[PDB]
Structure formats: C-alpha cells, structure tokens
Design a protein around this ligand. Structure first.
Ligand SMILES: [K+]
Ligand SMILES: [Mn+2]
Ligand SMILES: [Mn+2]
Ligand SMILES: [Mn+2]
Ligand SMILES: [Mn+2]
Ligand SMILES: [Mn+2]
Ligand SMILES: [Mn+2]
Length: 136
RNA sequence: ACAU
DNA sequence: CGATGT
C-alpha cells in the first residue's frame, strides 16, 4: 500500500538472459547507489536478483541497520526465504562463477541470522524499482 | 496468470 | 520477439 521509504532497494541488470549479469542496491528515498556488483559473464535474471537480495542482507547486517529490502522479483524473494536458489541454469565451465556465487550466498543464509523484512516492490502501482537499470 |  | 521463474 505505502512505500516504506526508509529501505534498501536492489535489482539485477543484464545483457542477455542468460547473459552478463550485474546488480546494485540504492537508497529508496534518495536513489543513492550504495553497492554495485562487477558484471558476471553468464548468469540468469533470477540468480542476479537473488544475489542482490543476499548482498543487501549482508550489507545491512554489517552496518547494524534494520531497514527492509525491496525486490521486484517474486522468484528471488522466495529463493531467499527457502535459502535455496532453484535455478535451471546448466552447471558447466561457463556458468561456474555465477553458480559459485549463488552457492556461497545460500551458504551464508544457512549460517547467519537476520530480521530484515524482504518486501515486494509493487511495480504495477509504483513504477520501476529505484535500482532498475532503465533497459526495458 | 503472475513476477521478472 | 526471446529468456527465467512460482
Ligand atoms: K520490473
Ligand atoms: Mn528486478
Ligand atoms: Mn546450492
Ligand atoms: Mn529492473
Ligand atoms: Mn520497452
Ligand atoms: Mn528491466
Ligand atoms: Mn519489454
């Protein structure tokens, strides 16, 4: 209903899907970019959305921040809740890096705690999430 | 049919 | 038009 402006917004960007994947996190209130991941040569939209949320969790935890995270990805929100990224992406030499990062993110979720609410950004009501890459 |  | 996901 109401945007929680005191929050962190995250999003993936890509060149192809599967394709080159990156993500960033921004202050929802200001749009200030708070972190940006260096592009990974091959991944999927959903793996990147998942990595972005998990990085957000770690970023807020390290800073002792109780802000919620917004993501526009129903899939990634569920994967974080399950602590399991059920990606269909083939595991081969080309996808090894993204799969390592995904597996390491899952490992972090299974060894750490957090209270951070992970909220759905309601794109149909509010427009593009503030971390969007402007490519659609 | 909904979310990317 | 193509793809990734529940
Ligand atoms: K969107
Ligand atoms: Mn997104
Ligand atoms: Mn795994
Ligand atoms: Mn976007
Ligand atoms: Mn368009
Ligand atoms: Mn887009
Ligand atoms: Mn389009």
């Amino acid at each position: 209903e109401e945007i929680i402006w005191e929050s962190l917004s995250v999003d993936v960007g890509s060149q192809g899907n599967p394709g080159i994947v990156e993500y960033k996190g921004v202050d929802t209130k200001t749009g200030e970019v708070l972190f940006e991941r260096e592009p990974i040569p091959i991944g999927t939209n959903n793996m990147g959305e998942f990595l972005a949320i998990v990085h957000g969790l770690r970023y807020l935890k390290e800073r002792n921040s109780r802000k919620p995270i917004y993501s526009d990805s129903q899939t990634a929100i569920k994967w974080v809740k399950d602590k399991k990224a059920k990606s269909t992406l083939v595991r081969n030499e080309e996808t090894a890096l993204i799969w390592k990062l995904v597996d390491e993110a899952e490992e972090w979720l299974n060894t750490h705690t957090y209270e951070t609410p992970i909220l759905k950004w309601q794109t149909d009501k509010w427009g593009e999430i503030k971390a969007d890459y402007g490519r659609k």
